[PDB]
């Protein structure tokens, strides 16, 4: 889920990058 500077840079990234653009584009 998260960490701090070594799982939530790339859990955020890699699961979180995918997901604010084509799943909910609140923009």
Do not use: H, Q, T
Request: net charge positive; hydrophobic share 55%.
């Amino acid at each position: 889920k998260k960490l701090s500077i070594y799982e939530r840079v790339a859990l955020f990234g890699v699961l979180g990058a995918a997901l604010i653009g084509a799943i909910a584009p609140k923009k």
